[PDB]
Amino acid sequence: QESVKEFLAKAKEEFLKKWESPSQNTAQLDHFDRIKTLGTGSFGRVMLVKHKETGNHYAMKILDKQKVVKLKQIEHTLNEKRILQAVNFPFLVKLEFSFKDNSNLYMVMEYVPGGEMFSHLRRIGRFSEPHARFYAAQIVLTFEYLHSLDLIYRDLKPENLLIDQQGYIQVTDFGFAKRVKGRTWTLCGTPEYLAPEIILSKGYNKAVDWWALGVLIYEMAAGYPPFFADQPIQIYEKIVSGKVRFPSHFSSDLKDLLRNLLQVDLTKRFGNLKNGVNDIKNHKWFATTDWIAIYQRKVEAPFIPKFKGPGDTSNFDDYEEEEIRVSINEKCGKEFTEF
Numbered sequence: 001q002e003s004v005k006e007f008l009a010k011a012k013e014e015f016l017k018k019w020e021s022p023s024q025n026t027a028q029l030d031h032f033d034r035i036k037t038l039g040t041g042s043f044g045r046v047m048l049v050k051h052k053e054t055g056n057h058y059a060m061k062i063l064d065k066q067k068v069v070k071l072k073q074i075e076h077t078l079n080e081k082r083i084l085q086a087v088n089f090p091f092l093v094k095l096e097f098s099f100k101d102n103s104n105l106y107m108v109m110e111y112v113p114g115g116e117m118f119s120h121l122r123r124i125g126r127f128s129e130p131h132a133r134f135y136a137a138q139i140v141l142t143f144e145y146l147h148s149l150d151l152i153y154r155d156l157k158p159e160n161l162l163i164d165q166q167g168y169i170q171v172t173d174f175g176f177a178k179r180v181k182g183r184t185w186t187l188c189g190t191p192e193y194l195a196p197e198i199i200l201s202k203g204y205n206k207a208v209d210w211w212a213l214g215v216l217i218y219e220m221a222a223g224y225p226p227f228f229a230d231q232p233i234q235i236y237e238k239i240v241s242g243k244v245r246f247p248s249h250f251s252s253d254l255k256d257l258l259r260n261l262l263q264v265d266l267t268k269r270f271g272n273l274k275n276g277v278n279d280i281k282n283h284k285w286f287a288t289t290d291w292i293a294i295y296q297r298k299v300e301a302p303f304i305p306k307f308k309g310p311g312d313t314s315n316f317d318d319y320e321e322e323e324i325r326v327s328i329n330e331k332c333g334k335e336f337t338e339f
């Protein structure tokens with residue numbers, strides 16, 4: 001409808017204005033108190049912090065510049081910050097501040113205290129079809145938004161979907177997202193979620209996000225992903241094969257949607273045909289979904305996470321607490337000039 005077309009046109013206008021003139025240097029480290037490490041690893045660290053003047057809580061992503069260079073993530077890190085400062089959608093975590101110092105890059109995001117979808121899925125075992133469909137509808141709308149801005153997300157998985165105080169999804173981690181007109185070539189993502197054309201080193205497009213949605217829906221409704229194996233090489237052989245097995249408790253409508261999202265031939269995959277996202281939105285598995293009410297956050301969620309307040313960390317896990325050190329000399333200044 002014309003209302004959807006005009007919404008997406010305005011969404012693109014507003015993205016492009018911030019994309020062409022990015023914000024920079026909007027806070028500094030000694031404006032915050034450090035509380036607790038919420039995650040660590042290949043993505044850097046994420047730390048719960050509290051702003052010393054306002055009292056607000058934030059999730060601060062800290063990247064070590066020297067390690068970013070050695071791991072060949074310079075362009076990806078610049079992508080992440082430039083995109084996050086330019087987007088705006090109900091199901092994306094908001095970037096509030098960004099800055100850099102002699103040693104590190106910092107992205108200060110809103111703190112979502114309900115935890116990762118991954119934790120709740122593994123605790124309950126599997127989600128009922130109505131519960132999985134509620135989350136899936138939010139991802140469909142989010143990808144419609146991102147793809148209309150020429151953005152590919154490239155890291156869909158349960159660990160990257162946080163559950164908020166209303167029971168709705170907020171997507172975090174734009175480390176692999178990129179603005180792409182046409183094809184792109186970089187090997188990235190997490191093994192269980194990679195489309196065949198990534199594994200085969202082809203030039204690929206936004207259809208890889210719709211494949212990943214198929215993997216997510218299967219995992220939410222079954223409790224485990226469709227191409228599971230013990231080692232990555234064995235996972236890749238299953239992905240390229242073009243065969244899956246569905247649990248008997250899956251409905252016929254769910255099986256039909258999944259066969260069309262998990263289509264090995266990218267030219268035949270739902271989301272990538274002449275009708276685009278509407279082949280997904282109009283599928284029988286989504287017949288009960290009120291797309292407008294979901295966007296407006298007017299549907300009652302299947303469950304609300306248990307937590308005590310905006311600073312509660314009980315839904316995240318425990319990590320060794322390490323220093324945030326800042327060298328007396330500047331490191332890698334030229335490489336990160338635009339950050």
Ligand SMILES: O=C(c1ccccc1)N1CCN2C(=O)OC[C@H]2C1
Pocket residue numbers: 038039043046059116159160172173316
């Ligand atoms: O940024 C976060 C976060 C971590 C803790 C609290 C809030 C947010 N992530 C979740 C875990 N993550 C992965 O498993 O890989 C990507 C990374 C993203």
